[model samples]
Target: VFINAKCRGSPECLPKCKEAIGKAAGKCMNGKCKCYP
Candidate 1:
């Protein structure tokens, strides 16, 4: 399972390795954690 910060999370993870912030995934909302199980 994958858990991302809800305020900076990806609903559907599209792995981006060449992004400037390091990994270009997505955002998590409300300081919560998003999990994919």
Candidate 2:
């Protein structure tokens, strides 16, 4: 599990970070997230 510090102290990002790490946004390139492919 990720911590608040890992998310740069953004509590709101906690859930998103967890979900994002587990699932893709359907798009990815250059080591960043984007809209669905």
Candidate 3:
């Protein structure tokens, strides 16, 4: 399944989201991190 997490365009936010999802499966869009599996 895929999910999205809201985040700022921060460098820290990307890796943190990646760590939580176990991969960098996300992109900054409309101020949110759209993540996938």
Candidate 4:
């Protein structure tokens, strides 16, 4: 899964790396953490 907005959390994740599954590959801008999972 991949998100380009606030994550707050990931439905299925590894939070240590921003909850991406294998690796957290995303960018967080403005406020919250953007999820790329």
**Could you tell me which residue pairs clash in candidate 2?**
none
Model 2: how far is 16 from its true place, Å? 0.5
Give me the runs in candidate 3 sitting further than 4 Å from their true place.
1-14
**Distance (Å) between predicted and true CA of 19, model 2?**
0.7
- TM-scores of the candidates are 0.23, 0.31, 0.45, 0.28
Show the lowest summed lDDT stretch of 10 residues, model 2: 1-10
Off by over 4 Å in 1: 1-27
- The best candidate in terms of TM-score: 3
**lDDT agreement of model 3 with the native:** 0.60
Question: How much is the lDDT of residue 23 in candidate 4?
Answer: 69
Q: For residues 1-37, what per-residue lDDT tens digits would candidate 4 score against the true structure?
A: 4444454444322352454455655444453444555
Q: What are the runs in model 2 whose C-alpha is more than 4 Å off?
A: 1-9, 23-37
Which sequence of candidate numbers ranks them by lDDT, best first? 3, 4, 2, 1
Q: What C-alpha RMSD separates each model from the true structure?
A: 6.9, 10.0, 3.0, 6.1
Residue by residue across 1-37, what tens digits does model 3's lDDT show? Answer: 2335567665645575677677666656666666555
Model 1 lDDT tens row, 1-37: 2233333435433242213234444434455433322
Show where candidate 4 strays beyond 4 Å. Answer: 1-22
